[PDB]
Write a protein that binds this ligand. Structure first.
Ligand SMILES: Cc1ccccc1-c1cc(C(F)(F)F)cc([C@@]2(C(C)C)C(C#N)=C(N)Oc3n[nH]c(C)c32)c1
Ligand SMILES: Cc1ccccc1-c1cc(C(F)(F)F)cc([C@@]2(C(C)C)C(C#N)=C(N)Oc3n[nH]c(C)c32)c1
Ligand SMILES: Cc1ncc(COP(=O)(O)O)c(CNCC(=O)O)c1O
Ligand SMILES: Cc1ncc(COP(=O)(O)O)c(CNCC(=O)O)c1O
Ligand SMILES: [Cl-]
Lengths: 442, 442
């Protein structure tokens, strides 16, 4: 007693937008540092009937029977996660149930410290995530700043983590967790150094590697597994998986953490796992382990360096004047145009990037930059030679933005009126579209 | 630079288990009250490239641009949700970003009362959800018991909500919110009488209708919208959508609740929404509104009535001696067997049901019943006449379970040994498989 008509027939209204979304993805130069493109295999999993099943609990300790095939899929995913991040299944545990990154971080933090618990993370302005204890004078913006007591550590005026300030803070604050690994940070992390500060106060070390996961797994960048009690990561960014999260816990350093973390995920915070996610994650984790995927990850940093170099060659300033990873942050103060202005201009030319704060911005009211990343375009087959063109399109967009701000004035309302119908934007869009539309598209 | 090889070729190991999973679903008599089977159109959305997009925030106020098509999908879903539940968009608002039921409830409760806030809900033992404040002497099992201060009310010895006890509690406890709507409650709710108690103590009225959603939408059962400040529902159960949740809030009764709920979902708890979920939900919400779906929902209650009656005719006791909805809870005290025992037996015969507590059970350690529901089987095409057979299979399973307990004893380990190889079970299974495999399968 159901309607099995195909999506096109069943919902022509929704099917049209999705074809449109597909086309806009197909014709966009996507510089969002957190985005990527999933293959058909990962999307077959997300559409799989395995999402029908309720399977609260863990494998072999399931509330319901008839979870025979779900247990195999959940354990195959845990196995591949541990393998991919080069961890022994004797020494490291993994939870694959968190629905997304923010959920995983809140669950993992609660496990360690509980309500009223003390945490330290990077400020959102300085590169840290919302789930790293972010708050404001007006409000406790994240639950992580409200259900926990959190303190926030800034990066220096050059845009690097200042360990002296972290320790200065850690000794007076005495937290149970110190969070490292960030949302918009263009350099590698000194986890070893972090591990030393946590011991000095007996705090837990929490490494959120969602933006840099593929680097860590493929050993291009520092390994937080060597020092961290917990490693959280999303699966949908550089890893190129579905939207989900992973929590890693070091049993050897902390016996009894496995149950503490597993109970935090369920039944403290979630109900039934989403099984299509789990299957999809397993499917991507097979791909992560191959030497082919390391080739892809290498390519992301190659492109990111070439992009950074090419932007400096056009006299554009970068936070920390370069990058060790997939991402860059452009400091736009040189041109006296805000980040949101450039985001609007870039969308008009089908360039997806996002506005981003910089060290000089005391206040989040106006982000003075934009953040860009190479994983999505690396996925679409772009090589080092392609980066000069991207740098060129970005340079042209900044210039156009300066022109439109001059012509229509600095107010954002005023600026936006200038955007529609601009001949140069339409010319730039066309140029963007022709080049983007041609590239391989999973 | 990606692998577009199909799932079967790319990951033969995973494809085998999913092919097995598909076969088990196809040949199982699924009585799980919370399960259903999604159609192909809902699964196409779940597999759509729309999940590639990061779109934090709300429509027309995204952090990022290039969310034009995403904004249409997110607004099309909210509209259809308000349409489907017969609420005017001026009086009622809805948030469509919660990833699942448990996340939605925690988020709504936080919005209403904050950390240390006071809540009341039904005890887990009596039919309440984990996210309704559930705790135990040994541990605060849910975050709802830990991040909030919760009080738990029980149903009477006949298995009915005791409103005197709710008021007895509410006046002494003085909560800011009172939850009603339950996980395993076989009767309808007097939402009106809840409002009367809520107004008396100036507490909010929270109705969690996840199990009964379709009934509420199609006006077959009491409409909580007339009395409630907040309504939460999952989309994956009787509503037959993907795994997601909806939060409804009443603007007229509480202006400025909209921002409170919306800020709670993001950025307080979640990060990027899962757009494939929202797309998937939009697709099911269109179907919810058709009169064909009312036909199906009506059929679910007919099958449930017929099932309760056929079970009473075989001298099987039902909690409350019947049902007003999709679910029945069987009291197995008559046969001196446990619900856990009966769950094993039923999985051995490809009958999916779950163990469930009853009013007499002091503790959830040994639940004395099982819970069944008709939505899945109703979806597969089963009619009233088909119920006698399902009631026949359940009686036979209860009988076999008594025999195996006689032969191998009451210890659970001892009992399970009896399960493999049993001729009657193998006989009962084939009977189940032959009948189940024939039915329409979306
Ligand atoms: C300040 C604030 C308060 C409440 C909700 C969101 C934000 C916010 C604002 C911005 C801004 F540029 F100012 F617009 C940027 C961000 C970033 C970036 C990546 C867009 C950000 C940054 N800078 C970091 N570190 O992390 C994130 N997590 N999610 C989002 C969306 C963000 C967040
Ligand atoms: C007691 C306990 C502590 C910690 C985690 C889970 C449970 C639990 C136990 C049972 C059992 F006793 F075994 F039948 C059942 C349940 C139910 C049913 C529907 C399986 C239940 C019930 N009775 C309610 N009301 O709600 C739920 N939400 N999630 C689960 C899984 C449940 C929960
Ligand atoms: C370090 C970090 N941690 C956690 C999350 C949470 O992910 P979910 O959106 O899945 O909750 C993000 C998202 N990062 C947003 C961005 O960089 O664009 C992140 O950057
Ligand atoms: C009343 C109620 N509320 C919230 C949830 C949470 O749903 P998620 O699993 O999507 O977190 C459930 C799940 N119901 C469990 C069952 O009936 O089997 C529920 O019954
Ligand atoms: Cl999903």
């Amino acid at each position: 007693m159901f309607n099995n008509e195909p999506l096109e027939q069943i919902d022509k209204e929704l099917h049209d937008i999705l074809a449109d979304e597909e086309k806009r993805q197909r014709e966009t130069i996507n510089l969002i540092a957190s985005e990527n493109l999933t293959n058909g295999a990962v999307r077959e999993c997300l559409g799989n009937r395995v999402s029908n099943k309720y399977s609260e609990g863990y494998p072999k300790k399931r509330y319901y029977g008839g979870n025979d095939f779900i247990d195999k899929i959940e354990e195959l995913c845990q196995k591949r996660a541990l393998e991919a991040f080069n961890v022994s299944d004797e020494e490291w545990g993994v939870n694959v149930q968190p629905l997304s990154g923010s959920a995983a971080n809140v669950q993992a933090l609660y496990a360690l410290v509980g309500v009223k618990g003390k945490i330290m993370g990077m400020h959102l302005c300085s590169g840290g995530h919302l789930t790293h204890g972010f708050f404001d004078e007006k409000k406790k913006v994240s639950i992580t700043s409200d259900m926990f007591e959190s303190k926030l550590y800034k990066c220096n005026s050059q845009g690097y983590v200042d360990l002296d300030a972290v320790r200065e803070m850690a000794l007076s604050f005495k937290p149970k967790v110190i969070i490292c690994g960030y949302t918009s940070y263009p350099r590698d992390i000194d986890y070893q150094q972090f591990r030393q500060i946590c011991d000095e106060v007996n705090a837990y070390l929490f490494a959120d590697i969602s933006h840099i996961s593929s680097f860590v797994a493929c050993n291009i960048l520092n390994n937080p597994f060597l020092h961290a009690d917990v490693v959280t990561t999303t699966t949908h960014k550089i890893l190129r998986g579905p939207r989900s999260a992973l929590i890693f816990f070091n049993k050897k350093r902390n016996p009894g953490i496995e149950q503490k973390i597993n109970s935090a995920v369920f039944p403290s915070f979630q109900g039934g796992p989403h099984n299509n996610k789990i299957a999809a994650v397993a499917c991507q984790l097979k791909e992560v382990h191959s030497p082919a995927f390391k080739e892809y990850t290498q390519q992301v940093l190659l492109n990111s360096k070439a992009l950074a170099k090419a932007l400096i060659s056009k006299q554009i300033d970068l936070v920390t004047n370069g990058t060790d990873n997939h991402l860059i942050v452009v400091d736009l103060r040189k041109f006296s145009i805000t980040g949101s202005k450039l985001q609007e201009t870039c969308n008009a030319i089908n360039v997806s990037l996002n506005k981003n704060t910089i060290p000089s911005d005391v206040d989040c009211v106006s982000p003075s930059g934009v953040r860009i990343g190479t994983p999505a375009m690396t996925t679409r087959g772009a090589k080092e030679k392609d980066m000069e063109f991207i740098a060129d399109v970005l340079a042209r967009a900044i210039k156009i933005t300066v022109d439109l701000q001059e012509q229509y004035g600095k107010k954002l309302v005023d600026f936006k009126k200038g955007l529609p119908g601009n001949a140069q934007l339409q010319q730039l869009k066309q140029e963007v579209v022709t080049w983007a539309g041609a590239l391989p598209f999973p």
